[PDB]
Enzyme design. Structure first.
Site, PDB file in Angstrom:
ATOM      1  N   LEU B 239       0.867  -1.163   0.000  1.00  0.00           N
ATOM      2  CA  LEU B 239       0.000   0.000   0.000  1.00  0.00           C
ATOM      3  C   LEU B 239       0.897   1.203   0.000  1.00  0.00           C
ATOM      4  O   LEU B 239       1.049   1.880   1.026  1.00  0.00           O
ATOM      5  CB  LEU B 239      -0.969  -0.038   1.201  1.00  0.00           C
ATOM      6  CG  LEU B 239      -2.048  -1.129   1.139  1.00  0.00           C
ATOM      7  CD1 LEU B 239      -2.766  -1.226   2.473  1.00  0.00           C
ATOM      8  CD2 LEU B 239      -3.093  -0.811   0.031  1.00  0.00           C
ATOM      9  N   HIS B 240       1.502   1.467  -1.173  1.00  0.00           N
ATOM     10  CA  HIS B 240       2.462   2.543  -1.358  1.00  0.00           C
ATOM     11  C   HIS B 240       1.896   3.903  -0.909  1.00  0.00           C
ATOM     12  O   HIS B 240       2.514   4.585  -0.111  1.00  0.00           O
ATOM     13  CB  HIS B 240       2.902   2.627  -2.843  1.00  0.00           C
ATOM     14  CG  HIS B 240       3.243   1.315  -3.470  1.00  0.00           C
ATOM     15  ND1 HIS B 240       4.496   0.743  -3.305  1.00  0.00           N
ATOM     16  CD2 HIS B 240       2.494   0.519  -4.269  1.00  0.00           C
ATOM     17  CE1 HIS B 240       4.475  -0.381  -4.007  1.00  0.00           C
ATOM     18  NE2 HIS B 240       3.288  -0.563  -4.605  1.00  0.00           N
ATOM     19  N   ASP B 241       0.730   4.289  -1.447  1.00  0.00           N
ATOM     20  CA  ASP B 241       0.127   5.597  -1.174  1.00  0.00           C
ATOM     21  C   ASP B 241      -0.253   5.771   0.325  1.00  0.00           C
ATOM     22  O   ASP B 241       0.192   6.754   0.923  1.00  0.00           O
ATOM     23  CB  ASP B 241      -1.014   5.852  -2.164  1.00  0.00           C
ATOM     24  CG  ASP B 241      -0.468   5.941  -3.579  1.00  0.00           C
ATOM     25  OD1 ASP B 241       0.780   5.912  -3.746  1.00  0.00           O
ATOM     26  OD2 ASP B 241      -1.264   6.072  -4.504  1.00  0.00           O
TER      27      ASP B 241
END
Ligand SMILES: O=c1[nH]cnc2c([C@@H]3N[C@H](CO)[C@@H](O)[C@H]3O)c[nH]c12
Ligand SMILES: O=c1[nH]cnc2c([C@@H]3N[C@H](CO)[C@@H](O)[C@H]3O)c[nH]c12
Ligand SMILES: [Ca+2]
Ligand SMILES: [Ca+2]
Lengths: 316, 316
Positions: B239-241
């Site tokens: 979940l980069h963001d």
């Protein structure tokens, strides 16, 4: 007796590696092939001959290589690192022995074709002579036993620019050709060599030892140490070329990861080495799909590599 | 209270980050500015409006941004990651609310100039709108409070190519412009986000929770999880963001290293982010010497970031 050819730009750490090779049991140095980088090719040739003379190896041929990278132009040499003539502050008279007539390209081609599957190439400088030997003879990549390369920076800072290691940066086109050639290649980058610290303390210990070439090795490393202390802010030198020599004769002290390596040949990141890690399946084809993978040194047993270099240089 | 603008290509993980921002106490979302990447800009705009509606934040403006990168041409979108619609192949009714008239560029410029030193920009996609805001207004870099960027790969593999992370690869010119702009920038790359693993077990706990948006977030993440399982060979999502949202509101959960960052805009390594570590004094000028350094997230407290994301999404 393992047959090797050392392609080199001596060069302070190259000089350490060359003398180590002459001191290494079970190893036969077929010749030294010279290239630019640390110094001009003519200075590299002079230093290679001085080393052969110093080591009582007057019979080891020195074959001079390319004066320019594949793209042409006068190369920028690392004289701020290796001294004005490439041998730090070491004042030695001109060698009496002369280079052989054949170029490095022809010497590389001839020995590999004469002893197929027997010769290992240790590449200590820009890869110009190796790419040229590949261009000349298509059987070279099939008959060369292996090529152990000191070059690149895999997930680590470069030393020529933040993105590129010097040997690759010195000839990006040659490096890309070699890495995609399909030869049995082993690459030792800055990611490995910057982990192997040699200190001002280690050098002073060497100065006070019975090592055959201890006095010369300390004299030559002096300029190298003074520059590292100035540039990095630490009294630590990296002996890149001796570390790649350890990968050549003691590969068990390293681990290798297989993958496709491409070199950036243009733009601000010119000389950057990018490796395909094989951890992600690519949705689309890209510049790394379809090439033969090579071996990249991934980890290094640092105390064992330090001990190996010290054993060779302290040997009376 | 903290005023933020989220520049985004929603996008499955962007949607998680946006809903987290709406659920975050002491955070005011001034607006969502849209860009391409995970989907077309028109799909990103629709999804941003759908999110504002889902969150009962109908007053939060959505300003549509660039449809193409700075160099022009149609972008390749990550539909294999985020679905044909950018929401994991989840069909949702059209939003009733409409985008505002102003472009993302103008919205960014107006809010930053109106509230100097107060607005933080969270950049979840390609950096096109941010670069366009800098180009339009020279006071933007002085008046933006900070720009927190999700992008790049610092001494780590890219996800667009072995060399480049997607957001940077999607607009290399915009990324290079942002990184050299002199604004107070914080960059969170794949080197950080791939350390924060979320599993199929974490998604089943979220489905078992009373999380306000649990149903919707579990629906959209099925496509995301299936692609990670297929591409990476593990039932683990990144979940980069949301991780970059944690760098924005909880920067104490990370360490940052200062350095000059340049982006490769051409060649095979297009999109590559190269950071000058500033530990080595360069003998000659190079593309990294004439710029203000930025902050690059170096380490991350993984359990604390996981707990923070879970707290926000499981919140009824
Ligand atoms: O700081 C440097 N800049 C450029 N070249 C080198 C070298 C030489 N180049 C190679 C490592 O970059 C290696 O073969 C060595 O002989 C050592 N240190 C530096
Ligand atoms: O594997 C991928 N390829 C391309 N883009 C993404 C993304 C999106 N792009 C960014 C991370 O590369 C992030 O903002 C996310 O929304 C996640 N995974 C991938
Ligand atoms: Ca060398
Ligand atoms: Ca995104």
């Amino acid at each position: 007796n393992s047959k090797i050819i050392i392609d080199t730009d001596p060069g302070i750490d190259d000089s350490v590696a060359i003398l180590m090779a002459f001191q290494m049991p079970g190893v036969q140095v077929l010749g030294l092939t010279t290239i630019f980088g640390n110094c001009t090719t003519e200075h590299a040739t002079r230093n290679a001959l001085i080393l052969c003379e110093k080591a009582s190896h007057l019979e080891v041929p020195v074959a001079e290589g390319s004066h320019e990278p594949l793209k042409g132009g006068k190369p920028h040499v690392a004289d701020f690192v290796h001294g004005p003539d490439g041998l730090g502050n070491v004042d030695l008279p001109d060698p009496t022995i002369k280079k052989v007539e054949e170029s490095a390209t022809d010497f590389l081609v001839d020995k590999v074709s004469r002893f197929p599957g027997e010769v290992s190439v240790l590449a200590l400088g820009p890869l110009t002579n190796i790419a040229l030997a590949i261009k000349k003879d298509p059987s070279f990549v099939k008959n060369v036993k292996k090529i152990v390369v000191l070059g690149g920076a895999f997930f680590a800072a470069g030393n020529a620019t933040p993105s590129a290691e010097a040997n690759i940066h010195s000839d990006p086109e040659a490096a890309d050709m070699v890495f995609t050639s399909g030869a049995d290649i082993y690459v030792v980058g800055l990611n490995i060599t910057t982990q192997v610290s040699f200190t001002d303390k280690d050098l002073l210990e060497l100065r006070n030892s019975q090592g055959k070439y201890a006095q010369f090795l300390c004299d030559v490393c002096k300029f190298y140490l003074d520059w590292h202390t100035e540039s990095y802010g630490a009294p630590v030198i990296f002996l890149h070329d001796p570390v790649s020599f350890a990968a050549l004769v003691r590969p068990e002290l390293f681990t290798f990861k297989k993958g496709v390596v491409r070199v950036e040949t243009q733009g601000i990141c010119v000389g950057h080495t990018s490796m395909d890690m094989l951890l992600k399946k690519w949705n689309s084809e890209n510049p790394w799909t379809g090439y033969s993978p090579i071996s990249v040194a991934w980890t290094v047993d640092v105390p064992k590599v330090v001990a190996f270099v010290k054993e060779l240089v302290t040997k009376p």
